[PDB]
Subunit: 551 residues, 2 copies
């Protein structure tokens, strides 16, 4: 690592971004009308990484007004549909790159979701893909650009996960999943922001400033894949890759009203990502796609898994990506863990999705009760930072300040002795086994297991900054390693989502979240998403049920 | 844990065994002819756990002479063929139990492979299985008894993995894999011996004494599943369950000339077994069957997996047990790791198997080179005993002496700090990734991967006592977690397997093993086995190739 003063390093980070932003504008080739509107947009980028600017109230509305038909006709197109145009040559690989580059630039200024553009290598990828049209026409993602979280290695770049001390950590390789996607006709064109330590459900770092929600600029984008949620919520990327060890894929997707899949560990390669606590295996992160488009989520998983990634990454299981043949479904609704109750907008989403499933004949819908959700915090309290956060704190030798959200994640971290880790590994495996028995207790008399559970992603829609003080609605499924797909349902409705009256809080933490929901106007136009949870390796059931819920 | 003096605790173990031996003889109901011959057999059981008796030179020969046709006509029958007789009711469950109980008693005396007989519960299992003949006739293992390593939990028994201090650790439940087998018509009838710490390729403990080879009583049975290898090598059980973290299933199976499957981690449940270092996850043990019968190995795997064990044990992958469709095969021959060369009998087995595969049109045979086998010892040297052997050494507070083989396994153990474990976890995962690339380097121009590798299980046939000082030929595949099937080839031939003349040792350890092989007469009648190695989750390819090699 580095030991220079952090203010100098933040400058170096800003320079890298500004250097890539300059090259991107050249690639995008604005006409004067757009250059004018772009110049006049409210920015979530400040003068320094501690200055958070003055973001728009509805960044997405500003985005749709600012960008021309020449761009939106491509970036607003569903990526699976756009792949048809790229295949039939109604649109060029370079043409698509130019539009999405322009979109990401406008998205970058409005939400601060881009850490580094990749226009040099992206133009080379897109140019040769056009030249090779006849031989690569058949590839399943031919011509499609995509975004990658900054923690994902890309050739010749620093990989820092937001820590300034790692700005000299250059890799000469791509992540396995990136090379696989390139082998299938795609290419990365932008690197998205990630926060300090990665262990916050928001997106603040001293490498980029603060990332904000795509639908309401006063709220967080979520985290840790906050850039990914914002960029793909603005539909300025066809899809992106994030990571999820505590909700870091599903929380951004839910806050920005798009799809995000925490895929089951052992399906797609993620270990070559960079994070804190490298070599820690007690609790493992997973990767997975975020996209505006469910069909795009499904196609990336299918494309990656059909490339047989277990022949490059031996931690992976050779299990085909297969659409389920189920005609009937048994589904549970997780109304609350009875520790922190959901805010009205989430509560209405649960009823909406419940009533829709009941209206289809082939769904049996039951209430799903929690199982010792307090044990999630206790076990993850010992295993997230099992070295007592020594590795993370060493990143602060530059003088880099400790963010308030990071404080929550590392407070109480013990430096575990080997026997302490063994104790909590046994606690971890026992809880997983107990929870499976809980899930199977919902099997019916004929032996039909629960296919999926519908649950909140968070006790609320996109949070106000520095208030993501409860993780269980996402970290529960990291402790269990269950596949979870966040999906859209509705938006805040000011008539329907007034605060609960005569509410009696369940505890101090529940009271905090109740008071956080002061009125729906504080979360105007914020998406209310939910998630589908399945047993391990049932990812595809979740996609199929999400398909039905959106038709 | 207990802290009484070990001499009485070994006493309590002997009485527990002797009380069950008394009950087994009552159940078996010897005729006077067998009772006389049994009384006069040379015993490998001594008066105390430090007296190793004086075993027969060829225990299997003495076993076949001692037992009547009334027993052998059942115990010598292939278990899959015996299942037809149990299903068609040509033989009762109780008849099969009595015969195999008798066989195991004779095997117990000759090889010292039995820790505790289970005749009370076995008679109840067999009786009610006969009573329920009409409703349970259909089960895939109806009426078949099987043996279990002592480390495997069974209702009402102590589970000690050979350590006297755990004699008061009684469980009120069976292992999941045991309950699955009982649900499919099988039942356990005997618990087999295991050694101290479980970390030796032999089978000596202060709970049972010394277990010897079924074919040559001067040699070890192997370990850690020494009882299982001996009991099933004598064909005194239809099959058994062992465990394998350093070769502890394949070494007994190979030394005793039978089949043994180190199944891929995550296919069949094993975590509820008892060992040292509970909660250690850096290197995980696996389970799997040992049997004289390849068809019985395959049927047990099929049976357990078709019970969907991932619905009780959430570490498992829902990957069906399916026979491969392959019509052509690519197979590599691993003649040596160029650290310890195999002895003449193993080298001859390699030639026999190579020429047999070549005489079939559909096998392409290539030489398979090692990839940094020295790294196996380095990494496992740090991760096998991650606490500096504190957990194991605490078992010796009873005064239980440290055996010489156990000494080797714990010498140099560091009490790893979290960062030290992280370093070696990264070394482990990097080595796995490097090795996969090495394996894939054998793919041919047409894109056909290597289907399997044929390798030694050990530098030699069944070793002389206290000489199992090299593990890599088995531990290589525990570090990589590759499925490995030990299988029979040939026996020592004193004319063909004379020592190499003018041999030049590769190093000090290779010199030791060369000098260990003084002449074939020291290993008279010893089976020369090899093993089939596959990539993760390709277990079934190994069964199909072994099927072809045995036809």
């Amino acid at each position: 690592m580095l030991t220079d003063n952090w203010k100098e390093l933040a400058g170096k980070a800003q320079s890298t971004f500004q250097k890539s932003l300059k090259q991107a504008i050249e690639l995008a080739d604005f006409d004067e009308g757009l250059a004018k509107r772009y110049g006049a947009l409210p920015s979530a980028i400040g003068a320094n990484v501690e200055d958070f600017g003055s973001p728009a109230q509805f960044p997405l509305e500003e985005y749709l007004k600012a960008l021309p038909k020449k761009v939106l006709d491509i970036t607003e197109k569903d990526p699976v549909e756009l792949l048809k145009d790229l295949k039939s040559r109604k649109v060029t690989c370079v043409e698509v790159l130019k539009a999405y580059t322009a979109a990401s630039i406008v998205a970058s200024k409005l939400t601060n979701c881009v850490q580094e553009f990749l226009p040099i290598e992206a133009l080379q990828y897109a140019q040769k893909l056009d030249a090779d049209y006849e031989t690569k026409k058949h590839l399943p993602l031919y011509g499609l650009p995509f975004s990658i979280k900054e923690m994902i290695p890309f050739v010749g770049r620093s990989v820092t996960h937001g820590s300034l001390c790692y700005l000299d950590r250059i890799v000469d390789y791509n992540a396995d999943i990136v090379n696989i996607l390139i082998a299938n006709g795609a290419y990365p064109f932008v690197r998205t922001t990630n926060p300090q330590s990665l262990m916050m459900l928001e997106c603040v770092s001293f490498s980029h400033g603060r990332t904000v929600n795509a639908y309401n600029g006063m709220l967080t984008s979520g985290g840790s894949s906050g850039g990914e949620g914002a960029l793909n919520g603005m539909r300025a990327s066809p899809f992106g890759l994030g990571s999820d060890i505590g909700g870091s894929i599903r929380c951004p997707a839910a806050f920005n009203g798009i799809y995000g899949l925490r895929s089951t560990l052992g399906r797609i390669p993620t270990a070559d990502y960079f994070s804190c606590n490298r070599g820690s295996e007690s609790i493992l992160s997973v990767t997975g796609p975020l996209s505006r488009s469910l069909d795009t989520v499904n196609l990336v998983m299918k494309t990656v898994i059909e490339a047989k990634p277990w022949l490059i990454d031996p931690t992976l299981v050779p299990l085909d990506w297969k659409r389920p043949e189920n005609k009937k479904f048994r589904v549970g609704i997780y109304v609350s863990d009875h520790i922190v109750n959901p805010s009205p907008p989430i509560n209405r989403a649960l009823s909406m999705v419940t009533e829709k499933l009941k209206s289809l004949g082939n769904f049996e819908v039951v209430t799903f009760e929690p199982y010792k959700p307090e044990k999630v915090t206790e076990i993850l309290g010992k295993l997230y930072f099992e070295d007592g956060a020594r590795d993370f704190r060493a990143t602060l030798q530059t003088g880099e300040p400790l963010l308030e959200q990071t404080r929550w994640a590392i407070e109480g971290a013990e430096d575990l002795d080997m026997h302490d880790q063994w104790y909590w590994n046994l606690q971890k495996q026992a809880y997983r086994k107990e929870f499976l028995k809980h899930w199977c207790s919902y099997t019916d008399n004929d032996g039909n297991v629960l296919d999926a559970v519908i649950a909140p992603v968070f006790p609320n829609v996109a949070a106000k900054h520095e208030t993501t003080k409860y993780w269980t609605y996402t970290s529960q499924w990291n402790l269990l390693d269950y596949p979870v797909l966040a999906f859209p349902v509705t938006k805040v409705d000011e008539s329907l989502d007034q605060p609960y009256k005569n509410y009696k809080p369940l505890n101090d933490l529940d009271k905090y979240f109740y008071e956080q929901y002061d009125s729906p106007s504080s979360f105007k136009n914020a998406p209310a998403n939910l998630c589908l949870v399945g047993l391990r390796f049932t990812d595809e059931k979740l996609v199929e049920i999400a398909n039905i819920l959106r038709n």
